[PDB]
RNA sequence: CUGCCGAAGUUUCCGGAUAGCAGAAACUCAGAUCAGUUUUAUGUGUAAAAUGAGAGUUUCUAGUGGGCCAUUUUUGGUAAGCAGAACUGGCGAUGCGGGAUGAACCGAACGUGAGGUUAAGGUGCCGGAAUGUACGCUC
RNA sequence: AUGUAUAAAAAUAGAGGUAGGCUACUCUCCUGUAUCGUAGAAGAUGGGCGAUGGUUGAUGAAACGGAAGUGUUUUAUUGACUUGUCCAUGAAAUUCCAUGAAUCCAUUGCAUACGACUUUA
C-alpha cells in the first residue's frame, strides 16, 4: 500500500464546501473520522469523515495534535505547498480548474491554438 | 400406454432417416467416412456357428433371421463445411462437383420431366 | 441533531416548603421542549416530584468546552429489554459529548433494536487516561503508531473506463 | 417462497394471527 | 458540419402521474447534462419543442413541431416539468425533445 | 448525463440485478442497448445457492403439456434478458418496444468488438459487494444447468483478446508518435495558460 | 442564429445590434434581449459611432394597404447603406487593434457533443 | 481488530513471489505454483520476511491468515526439503501385488484378498512412487506438494478398502506408516 | 331531468301507541338563554367562570324500531377456543389517496376547472419520487 | 439523425508502463469536466504568404477480417477542398420568436378418415 491514514498525511477534500482544498491529518479520531487543519486561513481546523477526503501520497513529519500555527510552521518548513503542485495529479486538477473558468472567447482562442498545433502532424518516415 | 420418451407420437417429417448424431472426431485416426445409405430388400434365415465363450451353445450352430439391404456404391457430389459458433454448428459454405448425374439432379425438382434441367 | 441541555427546576413554593431544593440535570434532547419533558419524566421517576406541582426555573444549552480535542467518553445506561431491566457501560472516542451520545443511540438502536424511550442516560464522564480506558478497540485507537489503509473507499452513468478503486 | 412455503399469507389468516396476538 | 444545434437535447420520459393516475397536461422531461434540481433552475422558462414528421406537405413541409415551455424541476435527479401547447401523445414516451436556449438570461 | 444511438455495455464484473435495472430504465428512456459478455456477469451469493435457485426455477412446469409451461432458457444472455424483462411493462406495447431495443449476446461478436464498450459504475461488483463475500458467475451457473457452449466461447474470446491486443499495440505506437510530436511544436507551450 | 454580433445600444425593449457587415453580414437590427447570450469577450468602442439616429420609428415597417420586388437592392435605400458603412468604418479600428476579434466574430457559435450550457460560462 | 498479522521468515529458497496472489515458490528442489485468490489477505514482501496482513477482518476471515501461513510454509518446505510418505503393505493370506508404471506415477494393485480386480490408481502431479529395498512390501511416496502426496496416500488406502467383512478380524489393507521430509 | 332539505337505524309502555331523530305552520324571544366541552367551589354528584353559538317553546306529519365489526371494563373462564353483559366508536346513507388485490387497516370525507402544498404511504426497475447522507447488525 | 466522432486486457488487499537485467528502476492512476474534431451566403468569390500536410469523391488494386467475418488497413492514380498564416470582395427589406418453378388434373403405395406424404409423368 502507498496510502495510510496516519498523523502527518496531506489529504485532498472532495465532498463538502471545502472541495479541492489541501488538508493534513493533525489527529485521528477513529476508523470513520479524522481531525484536519490547513495553513490557508480560509480552511478552519475541523473534524472530517474519511469519505470526504482522498489520501494523497505526500506525507510530512508532524507531531500528534499540533496546533494550527505550528502546523502552518511545519507546512512552511517542509514546503508542502508547491510540493503537491510538483505532482502530475495537481497539474491536471489545476488545468481542469482553468478550463472550467474559461469563457466563450477563450475557448475560441483554444480552438485556434489546437488547430495550429494540429497543423504540423509531421513525423519522420 | 408406452414409453413417454417417444411422444408426441406423430408422423415422421422425412421419408429418409436423418442422422441426428455422428461419432466424435479424432485427429489421431486418419480420414474416413462414418455413414452409408441403403435400401431394404427383405430378410432371410441363416445357419451360423456359435463361437460364444461361456454360452450354453458354444461351438454349435443356431438359426438367425437376417435383413438384407442393397447398398450400391454411393457417389460423392459435394462437400459442406461446418464452423462451430456460440449458437451451434453453422454451414459456412458448400462446394459441389462439376458434373452431377441425373439421379442427384432429379432431387432438386418435383417435376424433373417438365423442368428445363437448369440445375447447376 | 441532539443538543446538551442543563435543566433546573423545582416544585411550586408553598407554606410547607417555602424554599424547595433546585434540582439540576444534564440531559440530551433535540430541543428545549423535549429536554423539559424528559426532565419532568425523570424527576417524577426519581424524586416523585409531580410535573403538575412543579415549574422550570432555568434551561441552558451546553456547548462542548473543547470541541477540537479528541476525547474518550464512558457512558452508563439503563436499557429496557423484554424484561425491561438492564444496565451497561460503553466507551466512545470522538470530539464532542453530543457526538458520543449520538453514537451511543445509533449503536444501541442498531444492535438491541432500542428506542429513545427505552434508553435512559444514567451518567456521562470523560475518561482521559489510557489506564482507565478498558475497551480493546479504544486502546487500539490510542496506540501511538496508529495507521491503517482506508476501508470502504467506494449522475453520469456509463463510465467509459474501469474504476481504479485503489490508490 | 423458494424454501418450501409461501411467505405471503392469506388475508383472513393475517387477521386471525392479529387476533391470536391480541389474546 | 457541426456548426449548428443551438439547442440542448432532452427526452420525454412520461406524464406527471401518481401510481395509478396520469395527468397528460404536464410532462416530465429529462434534459441531458442536467443532474440536480439546482441545475434545472437554469433551464426553467426555456422553450422545449417536439419535432416530428407527417405524410402531408402542409405549407410545403414534411415536418411539424409542437412547442412547449419548461415549468419547474421534478425530483432530485434534474428532470423538469414541461407544458406544451398541445399535450404530447403517449407514443412520444422516450422520444427526443429540443430545449432551445431562449428566452435566455445569460 | 448523455446518450448515444447505441450503447455497448461490457457486462464483465457487473451484477445481474444492478445492471438489469439500469438497462431497463435506459430502454424505457428510448435508447438502444447492447450488453456483451453476458456470460461474465456476477450474482450475489455463493455458487451452490444460486444453482439451487435456478434448479427450483426448473421445477416450475405444468402437468399438461410442459411445452405450455415456463420455457427455461439456459444461455447467460437469455438469463440476463429474463431479468431485464421482468423490470419492464412487457404486457403493453411500450414494454414490448423496449425489449426489442435490447440485444444481449454471449462474448463479443465481430460487429461489437470494434466499438467502445462502456461500463456501469452502479452495477460493478468491486464497488457494490463487500470484499470477501461470496458471488457466483452466470457463465459457470449456465454451463452447469445445461448451457453447452462454454468452451467455444472461451476459445473465441481468447482469439478476440489476441487480435484486440495487437490492435492496441498498433494504436499505442501511433499514440506514442503523436504524443512525441505534441510538445515538439512550441505553440503548445506558447499559450497553454488556458489549461490545454 | 449562432452569429456573433456587436451591441451598439439598448433601445426601449430591444438591442440595436450589428456585426461588422464586412465580417459576418449582420446589418443593424433590433433583437429582443431575451434572445441574446451576452458573452464576456473584451469590450470594444461604441462611443465613437452615432446611435441616436436609430429609433423605433426608423426600424418600423411600412403599411400593408412581390418577392422580386422589395429585396435588398430596390427596398434597401442608399442612406441605410451609408449608416451601415459608417458603422463598420467606426468599429473596424477597434477590432483590428485587439487580436482575434475579427476572426472571433466571423466564426459562428454552436453547441457540440458534451457541451452543457448550465456549466459553460459565456 | 484493526491489525492482525503473521510473519514468516524465508529460507534460502530462490523466489517466493506472490504476484497477483499467485505464490510461485522456486527452490533448490523445484518450482511450485499455487493460487491464493480465495483469501483476501495482504501479502507484503520485504527482504527476508513476508507479512500476511488483514485489516478490519471478521473472525471467519481472520482464521484464513494462519491457514494461508501454514500452506505457504508447507510448500516452502517442499521446494527446500520435499515430502516423503512411507506406507507398509498389510496382508493376511494373499500377498498384495504392486507394480509401478511411468516411473511410478500410476500404481496398479492386484491379488488383494483374492480379488481378481486390478485396481489402478494414478498419483497427483509432483509425486513419484517407488518400492523400498531396505524394507520389504514398502511403498514410498515422495514429491514436492505435501497435499498431493498425502492425497495420493489417502486415495491408495481408500481404494484398498475391505467391505462387508469384520474389521476386527480382517486386517488386510494399505496404511500410512511414516510421514516426513526427504532428509 | 335537474336542484334543495335529510334521517332513524331504539328507548319507554301494552302489532301498535309514545318518546327520539327530520321538516312545516303559527307564536316570543337578543340587559336571553343554551351546550355530547373545560375550569372553580361545596360536600363521584351538586352549585357558579372560560369558550362557542341568537336562543326558546306550542301545534302536525312523514320515514325509522335492525344488525355487523372493534376498543375498554368485567363475569366465568377452557385441554385450547370462547361464552355473558356494559361502553362509545366504525360501517351502515359514502365516493377518493395509500395498504400488490380486498365490507371492515392507515389518511381523507365529494359542485365544474387552473395553479400551489401536503396527509397516509413511498423514491433500484415495473412506478410518479435520492442506486441520497451518516452509523451499526446480518451470509 | 443534427459531430448519430472514440474497439487493449486484467487486477481492485492493484495494475500499467518507461528505463533496465523471471529480479533490481523510477514514473503514471485517484474515471471522459478526457481525446479526436470544430472559424467560412449548411458554409459564397478571388488574391497572397507558409507548408508539402490533412480531409475526402471516383477508379485500379492487393493484404486482412467467419462469432453474426458486411468491415479493417496498405495503397497506385484521378477529381476536389484546405482555416496553417495573412488579405480583399459578397450576404442584407427574412428590417424582434416560429421549421425459371410450384400446384391442380393424372400416376404410384414406401402413405392414407379427408388433406397430407413417397413416387412417375
Q: Which of A35, F84, F142, F125 is nearest to C99 (CA)?
A: A35
Angle between helices F76-85 and F138-145 (to 10 degrees): 110
Resolution of this model in Å is 3.2
Among G residues 100-119, those touching chain E with beta carbons less than 8 Å apart: 108-112, 116-119
**Sequence-distant (≥ 6) Cβ neighbours of residue H105 within 8 angstroms:** H122, H123, H127, H128, H129
Report d(CA F10, CA F124) in Å as an integer.
Answer: 11
List alpha helices for chain G, DSSP H.
21-24, 56-59, 78-97, 101-106
Residue of C nearest to E33 (CA): C156
F39 at interface of B, judged by CB pairs closer than 8 A: no
C83 exposure class (CB count in 10 Å sphere: 0-12, 13-18, 19+): exposed
Helix, strand, or coil (residue E33): coil
Q: How far from F188 is each of A99, A101, C135, F194, CA to CA, in Å?
A: 15, 20, 60, 11
3-state secondary structure string across chain F: CCCCCEEEEECCCEEHHHHHHHHHHHHHHCCEEEEECHHHCEEECCHHHHHHHHHHHHCCCCCCCHHHCCCCCCCHHHHHHHHHHCCCCCCCHHHHHHHHCEEECCCCCHHHHCCCCEECHHHEHHHHCCCCCCEEEHHHHHHHHCCCCHHHHHHHHHHHHHHHHHHHHHHHHHHHHHHHHHHHCHHHHHCHHHCC
Distance (Å, rounded) from C-alpha B84 to C-alpha G106?
60
| H34 beta partners | H23
Nearest by CB: E102 against G34, G110, G116: G34
The boundaries of the domain holding residue F72 are 1-150
Question: Which residues partner with E67 through β-bridges?
Answer: E49
Unique residue bearing C-alpha cell 437376417: B66
Whether A66 and A74 have beta carbons less than 8 Å apart is answered as yes
Which residues touch H12 (CB under 8 Å, ≥6 apart)?
Answer: H27, H28, H80
Count up the domains in chain H and report the number: 2
Q: Which of residues 9-48 of F touch C (CB under 8 A)?
A: 9, 13, 22
CB A67 within 8 A of CB A20: no
Which domain covers residue E13, as residue numbers?
1-106
Give C-chain residues touching A30 at CB under 8 angstroms. 93-94, 141
Domains of chain G, residue spans: 1-122
**Residue H36 and residue H1 share a domain:** yes
Alpha-carbon span H33 to H26, nearest angstrom: 9
Burial (CB < 10 A; 0-12, 13-18, 19+), residue H54, is buried
Task: Retrieve residue H93's grid coordinates.
Answer: 493370506
Distance F63 CA to J88 C1' (A): 90
* CA closest to J85 C1', residue: A116
Q: Which long-range contacts (CB under 8 A, 24 or more apart) does H89-97 make?
A: H89/H137, H89/H138, H89/H139, H89/H174, H90/H171, H90/H172, H90/H173, H90/H174, H90/H175, H91/H137, H91/H172, H92/H170, H92/H171, H92/H172, H93/H172, H94/H172, H95/H137, H96/H137, H96/H160, H96/H172, H96/H174
Q: How far apart are CA H15 and CA H36, in angstroms?
A: 16
Count contacts between A and F (CB, < 8 Å): 38
F124 and F49, same structural domain?
yes
Tell whether the torsion through CA atoms of F9, F15, F20 and F21 is positive or negative.
negative
Residue whose C-alpha is closest to residue E15's, from E100, E83, E63? E83
Task: Provide, as residue numbers in chain F, all residues whose Cβ is less than 8 Å from the Cβ of C160.
Answer: 116, 118-119
A78 forms beta bridges with none
What angle is formed at CA F128 by the lines to CA F42 and CA D7, rounded to 5 degrees? Answer: 75
Residue F74: its chain B contacts at CB < 8 A? none
Specify whether F173 is located in the same domain as F139.
no
List, as ranges, residues 52-111 from A with C-beta within 8 Å of C.
55, 57, 64-65
Instruction: Report CA(B92)–C1'(J61) in Å, whole number.
Output: 27
The answer to whether the C-beta of F33 is closer than 7 A to strand I is no
Domain span at residue H139 reads 83-183
| Strand-pair category, F32-36 with F102-104 | parallel
Look at chain F and report how many structural domains it folds into.
2
Phi and psi, residue C108, nearest 5°: -65, -40
CA distances to A37, B57, B58, B59, H116 from B54, in Å: 97, 9, 7, 10, 18
Secondary element (H or E) of residue A26: strand A22-30
Do the chains F and E touch each other, judged by at least 3 C-beta pairs below 8 angstroms?
A: yes
CA atom of E2 to C1′ atom of I34, Å: 85
Interface contact C163, partner F, CB < 8 A: yes
Question: How close does chain A come to H42, measured CA to CA in Å?
Answer: 9
User: What 3-state class would DSSP assign to E72?
Assistant: strand
Cβ contact C2:C121 at 8 Å: no
> Which residues from chain F sit within 8 angstroms of residue A114, using beta carbons?
196
Q: Are strands F32-36 and F6-10 parallel, antiparallel or unpaired?
A: parallel
Other Cβ atoms closer than 10 A to E29: 27
How far CA H22 is from CA of A106, D16, E20, H17, H32, in Å, comes to 53, 60, 57, 8, 10
CA distance H126 to chain F (A): 27
A115: distance to nearest CA of chain F, Å? 10
Nearest CA in chain F to C157: F120
Is the Cβ atom of F134 within 7 Å of strand I at any atom? Answer: yes
Calpha distance C64→C70 (Å, rounded)? 12
Out of H31, H47, H82, pick the residue that ends a domain.
H82
**DSSP labels for H30-56?**
-EEEEE-TTS--EEEEETTEEEEEEES
Nearest to F187 among A102, A117, A123 (CB): A117
- Radius of gyration (C-alpha) of chain B in whole angstroms: 22
For A4, the closest chain H residue by CA position comes to H55
Of all protein residues, which has its CA closest to the C1' atom of J68?
F109
Residue keyed to cell 475391505: H162
Rounded Cα distance between A14 and H24, Å, is 40
Per 3-state DSSP, chain E is made up of helix, strand and coil in percentages (nearest 5) of 10, 55, 35
In A77-106, the residues whose Cβ lies within 8 Å of chain H are none
The grid cell for C4 is 446538551
Statement to judge: residues H91 and H173 lie in one domain: yes
F152 touches chain B (CB under 8 A): yes
Phi/psi of residue C153, each to 5°?
-65, -50
Residue H7: strand pairing partners: H51
Nine cell digits for residue H181: 521430509
C-alpha atoms less than 13 angstroms from C-alpha of C118 in its C-beta half-sphere: 15
Residues on chain G touching A104 (C-beta within 8 angstroms): 39-41, 109, 120-122
Q: How far is CA F89 from the centre of its chain?
A: 22
Q: Is the peptide bond before E103 cis (omega within 30 degrees of 0)?
A: yes
Specify the 3-state DSSP secondary structure of G7. Answer: strand
Cα(C75)–Cα(C78) distance, integer angstroms: 10
Hey, what's the cell of A78? 517542509
For the CA of D11 and the C1' of I92, the distance in angstroms is: 23
Cα separation of F18 and H11, whole Å?
48
Give the distance, in angstroms, between residue F26 CA and nucleotide I90 C1': 48
Q: Which of residues 1-23 of D touch strand I (CB under 7 A)?
A: 8, 11, 19, 22-23
Window 82-101 of E: residues touching F by CB (8 A cutoff) are 93-96
Q: What gap in Å lies between CA F150 and CA F39, rounded to an integer?
A: 9
User: What gap in Å lies between CA F138 and CA F54, rounded to an integer?
Assistant: 11
Co-location of F3 and F62 in the same domain: yes
- From the Cβ of E79, is strand I under 7 Å away? yes
Give the pairing type, strands G29-32 and A46-49.
Answer: unpaired
Cis before residue F185, ω within 30 degrees of 0?
no
Query: Sign (positive/negative) of CA torsion A6, A7, A9, A13?
Result: positive
Neighbouring C-beta atoms of residue B108, cutoff 10 Å: 12
Is residue H112 domain-shared with residue H170, that is, in the same domain? Answer: yes
* Record: contact A104-G40, CB cut-off 8 A: yes
Residues of chain F in contact with residue C151, where contact means CB-CB under 8 angstroms, are none
Contacts for A118 with CB less than 8 Å, ≥ 6 apart: none
Last residue of a domain, one of H82, H113, H137: H82
What is the layout of strands, in order, in the sheet containing C3-11?
Answer: C23-29, C3-11, C54-61
| Measured CA angle at H50 (ends H45, H53), to 5 deg | 95
Report the C-alpha gap between E102 and C36 in whole angstroms. Answer: 56
Let me know whether H93 and H63 are in one domain. no
How many CB atoms within 10 Å of residue F22?
Answer: 21
Amino acid at each position: 500500500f502507498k496510502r495510510y491514514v496516519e498523523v502527518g498525511r496531506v489529504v485532498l477534500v472532495t465532498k463538502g464546501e471545502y472541495t479541492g482544498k489541501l488538508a493534513v491529518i493533525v489527529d485521528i479520531v477513529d476508523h470513520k473520522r479524522a481531525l484536519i487543519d490547513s495553513p490557508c486561513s480560509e480552511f478552519p481546523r475541523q473534524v472530517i469523515r474519511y469519505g470526504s477526503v482522498v489520501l494523497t501520497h505526500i506525507v510530512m513529519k508532524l507531531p500528534r495534535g499540533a496546533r494550527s500555527g505550528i502546523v502552518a510552521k511545519k507546512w512552511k518548513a517542509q514546503d508542502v505547498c508547491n510540493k503537491w503542485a510538483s505532482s502530475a495529479w495537481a497539474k491536471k486538477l489545476e488545468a481542469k480548474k482553468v478550463r472550467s473558468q474559461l469563457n466563450d472567447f477563450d475557448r475560441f482562442a483554444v480552438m485556434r491554438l489546437k488547430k495550429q498545433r494540429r497543423e504540423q502532424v509531421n513525423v519522420a518516415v | 400406454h408406452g414409453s413417454l420418451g417417444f411422444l408426441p407420437r406423430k408422423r415422421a417429417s422425412r421419408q429418409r432417416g436423418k442422422v441426428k448424431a455422428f461419432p466424435k472426431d479424432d485427429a489421431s485416426k486418419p480420414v474416413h467416412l462414418t455413414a452409408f445409405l441403403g435400401y431394404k430388400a427383405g430378410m432371410t434365415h441363416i445357419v451360423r456357428d456359435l463361437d460364444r465363450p461361456g454360452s450354453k451353445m458354444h461351438k454349435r450352430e443356431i438359426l438367425e433371421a437376417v435383413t438384407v439391404i442393397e447398398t450400391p456404391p454411393m457417389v460423392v457430389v459435394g462437400v459442406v463445411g461446418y464452423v462451430e459458433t456460440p449458437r451451434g454448428l453453422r454451414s459456412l459454405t458448400t462446394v459441389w462437383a462439376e458434373h452431377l448425374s441425373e439421379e442427384v439432379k432429379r432431387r432438386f425438382y418435383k417435376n424433373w420431366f417438365k423442368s428445363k434441367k437448369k440445375a447447376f | 441533531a441532539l443538543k446538551e441541555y442543563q435543566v433546573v427546576g423545582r416544585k411550586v413554593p408553598t407554606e410547607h416548603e417555602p424554599v424547595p431544593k433546585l434540582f439540576r440535570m444534564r440531559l440530551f434532547a433535540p430541543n428545549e421542549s423535549v429536554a423539559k419533558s424528559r426532565y419532568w419524566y425523570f424527576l417524577k421517576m426519581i424524586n416523585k416530584v409531580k410535573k403538575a406541582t412543579g415549574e422550570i426555573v432555568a434551561i441552558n444549552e451546553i456547548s462542548e468546552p473543547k470541541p477540537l480535542k479528541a476525547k474518550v467518553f464512558g457512558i452508563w445506561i439503563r436499557y429496557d429489554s423484554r424484561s425491561g431491566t438492564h444496565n451497561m457501560y460503553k466507551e466512545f472516542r470522538d470530539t464532542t459529548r453530543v457526538g458520543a451520545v449520538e453514537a451511543m443511540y445509533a449503536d444501541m438502536a442498531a444492535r438491541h433494536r432500542a428506542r429513545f424511550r427505552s434508553i435512559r442516560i444514567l451518567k456521562v464522564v470523560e475518561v482521559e487516561k489510557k489506564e482507565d480506558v478498558r475497551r480493546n478497540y479504544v486502546k487500539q485507537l490510542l496506540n501511538p503508531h496508529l495507521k491503517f489503509p482506508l476501508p470502504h473507499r467506494r449522475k453520469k452513468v456509463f463510465a467509459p473506463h474501469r474504476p481504479s478503486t485503489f490508490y | 417462497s423458494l424454501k418450501k412455503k409461501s411467505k405471503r399469507r392469506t388475508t383472513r389468516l393475517r387477521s386471525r394471527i392479529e387476533k391470536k396476538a391480541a389474546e | 458540419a457541426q456548426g449548428h444545434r443551438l439547442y440542448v437535447k432532452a427526452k420525454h420520459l412520461s406524464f406527471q402521474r401518481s401510481k395509478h393516475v396520469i395527468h397528460p397536461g404536464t410532462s416530465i422531461v429529462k434534459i441531458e447534462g442536467c443532474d440536480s434540481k439546482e441545475e434545472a433552475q437554469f433551464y426553467l422558462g426555456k422553450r422545449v419543442c417536439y419535432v416530428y414528421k407527417s405524410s402531408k406537405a402542409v405549407r410545403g413541409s414534411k415536418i411539424r413541431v409542437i412547442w412547449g415551455t419548461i415549468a419547474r424541476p421534478h425530483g432530485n435527479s434534474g428532470a423538469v416539468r414541461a407544458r406544451f401547447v398541445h399535450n404530447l401523445p403517449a407514443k412520444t414516451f422516450g422520444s427526443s425533445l429540443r430545449v432551445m436556449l431562449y428566452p435566455s438570461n445569460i | 448525463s448523455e446518450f448515444q444511438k447505441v450503447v455497448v455495455i461490457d457486462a464483465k464484473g457487473h451484477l445481474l440485478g444492478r445492471l438489469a435495472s439500469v438497462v431497463a430504465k435506459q430502454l424505457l428512456g428510448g435508447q438502444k442497448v447492447v450488453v456483451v459478455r453476458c456470460e461474465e456477469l456476477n450474482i450475489s451469493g455463493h455458487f451452490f445457492r444460486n444453482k439451487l435457485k435456478y434448479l427450483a426455477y426448473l421445477r416450475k412446469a405444468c402437468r399438461y403439456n410442459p411445452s405450455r409451461g415456463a420455457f427455461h432458457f439456459r444461455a447467460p444472455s437469455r438469463i440476463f434478458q429474463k431479468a431485464v424483462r421482468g423490470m419492464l411493462p412487457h404486457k403493453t406495447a411500450r414494454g414490448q418496444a423496449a425489449l426489442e431495443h435490447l440485444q444481449a449476446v454471449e462474448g463479443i461478436p465481430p460487429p461489437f468488438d470494434k466499438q467502445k464498450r462502456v461500463v456501469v459504475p452502479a452495477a460493478l461488483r468491486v464497488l457494490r459487494l463487500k470484499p470477501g463475500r461470496k458471488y457466483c458467475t452466470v457463465g459457470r451457473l449456465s454451463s452447469e444447468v445445461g448451457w453447452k457452449y462454454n468452451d467455444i466461447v472461451a476459445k473465441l474470446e481468447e482469439r478476440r483478446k489476441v487480435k484486440s491486443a495487437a490492435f492496441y499495440q498498433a494504436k499505442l505506437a501511433k499514440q506514442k508518435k503523436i504524443a512525441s510530436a505534441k510538445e515538439a511544436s512550441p505553440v503548445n507551450q506558447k499559450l497553454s495558460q488556458f489549461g490545454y | 442564429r449562432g452569429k456573433r454580433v456587436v451591441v451598439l445600444s439598448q433601445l426601449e425593449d430591444t438591442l440595436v445590434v450589428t456585426g461588422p457587415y464586412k465580417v459576418n453580414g449582420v446589418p443593424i437590427r433590433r433583437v429582443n434581449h431575451r434572445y441574446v447570450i451576452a458573452t464576456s469577450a473584451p469590450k470594444i468602442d461604441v462611443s465613437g459611432v452615432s446611435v441616436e439616429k436609430f429609433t423605433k420609428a426608423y426600424f418600423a415597417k411600412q403599411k400593408r394597404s412581390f418577392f422580386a420586388e422589395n429585396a435588398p437592392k430596390n427596398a434597401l435605400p442608399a442612406e441605410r447603406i451609408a449608416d451601415q458603412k459608417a458603422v463598420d468604418a467606426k468599429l473596424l479600428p477597434a477590432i483590428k487593434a485587439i487580436p482575434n476579434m475579427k476572426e472571433y466574430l466571423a466564426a459562428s457559435f454552436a453547441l457540440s457533443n458534451g457541451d452543457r450550457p448550465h456549466l459553460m460560462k459565456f | 481488530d484493526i491489525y492482525k498479522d503473521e510473519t514468516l521468515t524465508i529460507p534460502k529458497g530462490v523466489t517466493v513471489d506472490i504476484k497477483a496472489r499467485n505464490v510461485t515458490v522456486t527452490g533448490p528442489r523445484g518450482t511450485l505454483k499455487q493460487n491464493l485468490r480465495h483469501v483476501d489477505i495482504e501479502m507484503k514482501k520485504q527482504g527476508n520476511t513476508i507479512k500476511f496482513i488483514v485489516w478490519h477482518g471478521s473472525r471467519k476471515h481472520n482464521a484464513c491468515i494462519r491457514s494461508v501461513y501454514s500452506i505457504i510454509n508447507n510448500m516452502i518446505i517442499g521446494v527446500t526439503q520435499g515430502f516423503r510418505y512411507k506406507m507398509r503393505l498389510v496382508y493376511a493370506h494373499f500377498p498384495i501385488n504392486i507394480n509401478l508404471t511411468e516411473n511410478g506415477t500410476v500404481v496398479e494393485i492386484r491379488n488383494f484378498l483374492g480379488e481378481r480386480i486390478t485396481r489402478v490408481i494414478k498419483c497427483l502431479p509432483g509425486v513419484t512412487v517407488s518400492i523400498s529395498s531396505a524394507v520389504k512390501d514398502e511403498i514410498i511416496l515422495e514429491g514436492n506438494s505435501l497435499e498431493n502426496v498425502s492425497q495420493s496416500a489417502a486415495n491408495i488406502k481408500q481404494i484398498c478398502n475391505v467391505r462387508n467383512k469384520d474389521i476386527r478380524k480382517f486386517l488386510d489393507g494399505i496404511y500410512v506408516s511414516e510421514r516426513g521430509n526427504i532428509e
